[PDB]
Amino acid sequence: QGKLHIPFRLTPTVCPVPLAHTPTVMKWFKGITLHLTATRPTLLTTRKLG
Amino acid sequence: QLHYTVQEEQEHGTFVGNIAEDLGLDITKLSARRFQTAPNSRSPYLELNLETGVLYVNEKIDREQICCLLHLEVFLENPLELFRVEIEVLD
Amino acid sequence: LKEATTHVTAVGSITLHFSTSSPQANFIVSLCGKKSTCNAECKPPADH
Numbered sequence: 001q002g003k004l005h006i007p008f009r010l011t012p013t014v015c016p017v018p019l020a021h022t023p024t025v026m027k028w029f030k031g032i033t034l035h036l037t038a039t040r041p042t043l044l045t046t047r048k049l050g
Numbered sequence: 051q052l053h054y055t056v057q058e059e060q061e062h063g064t065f066v067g068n069i070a071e072d073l074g075l076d077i078t079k080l081s082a083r084r085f086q087t088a089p090n091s092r093s094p095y096l097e098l099n100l101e102t103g104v105l106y107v108n109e110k111i112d113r114e115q116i117c118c119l120l121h122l123e124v125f126l127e128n129p130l131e132l133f134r135v136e137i138e139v140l141d
Numbered sequence: 142l143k144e145a146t147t148h149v150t151a152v153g154s155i156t157l158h159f160s161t162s163s164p165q166a167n168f169i170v171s172l173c174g175k176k177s178t179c180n181a182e183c184k185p186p187a188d189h
Contacts (some may be wrong), residue, residue, distance in 0.1 A: 011089045014130040027189045 072101030
């Protein structure tokens with residue numbers, strides 16, 4: 001018989017995300033060591049450029 | 051972070067504050083950067099012009115329904131930025 | 142080499158910078174089209 005609107009639609013916006021403490025590099029022969037400080041679980045990813 | 055004031059029982063469409071002027075934003079590029087009211091902070095008593103960036107009174111102000119401060123948020127693209135506006139209501 | 146062109150006077154000297162991947166630096170450089178051979182003994186780098 002009719003249609004009613006579903007209010008409160010999902011719109012894009014901007015919102016901040018934390019920036020973790022940048023690690024210290026302890027580079028060595030064909031390798032690096034990252035000393036990581038993270039009060040909360042943060043995601044680290046690595047990939048080779050080959 | 052923006053501080054503005056309105057009077058008690060103020061008429062609709064009256065001036066509140068120039069957001070684009072106080073932020074130092076250029077006037078000819080609000081639409082190019084997609085000036086828009088943030089969906090989290092929606093105020094029925096306030097409305098802002100997208101072209102000029104000037105805040106205006108939308109509905110008639112009433113402390114009894116409000117009570118205090120009025121909170122609003124705007125967001126811009128390229129770069130992604132967020133700004134906060136707070137309005138004090140006199141009695 | 143690092144540089145592509147240089148301004149030359151009637152007499153004198155010019156300095157250039159270059160990057161190599163060889164343990165020795167034996168290569169032909171052309172200045173104004175004239176060729177010359179450079180001989181050296183390159184050292185491994187300190188930075189890992």
